Amino acid sequence: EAGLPTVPVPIPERDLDICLMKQSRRTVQRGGCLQFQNLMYRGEYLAGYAGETVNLRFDPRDITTILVYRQENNQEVFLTRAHAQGLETEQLALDEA
DNA sequence: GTGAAGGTTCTCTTCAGTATTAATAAGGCCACTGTTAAAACGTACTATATAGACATCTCCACAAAAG
């Protein structure tokens, strides 16, 4: 408590979580579909980005709601939550999948 | 006429002619070329409208080292 140059900022816990999520590369393909571990997903703006690779963040405890990111101006930007179609109801862990 | 047959003159004609307005024409066979529509007909430099043998990237699944 005495040896801190300044008291740390109270981190927004969703931001911590978002940067704790592991991530993979896939390309949005035809119809705004993207494959990830046999599941398929889509979200509210995906199809406009069909044809290029996007960065998407996943939590192995619940893969059903992916967060997907574009790279533009060589900067990361969030697109939308890509939901596993028909599974937007209860959680699925990666290990059984 | 009492009826029939027959006698007689009548002129001059140097005057009249010559001009437009004109209708599409009124020729028919023969043969022989040479245009004049206009019909029939070989084939070219094109403008597209496909149909489908291929090449490609992507997503998902297996052996080697460290705690």
UniProtKB/TrEMBL annotation:
Domain of life: Bacteria
Residue ranges of the TM segments: none
Listed name of the protein: TnsB
Organism: [Scytonema hofmanni] UTEX 2349
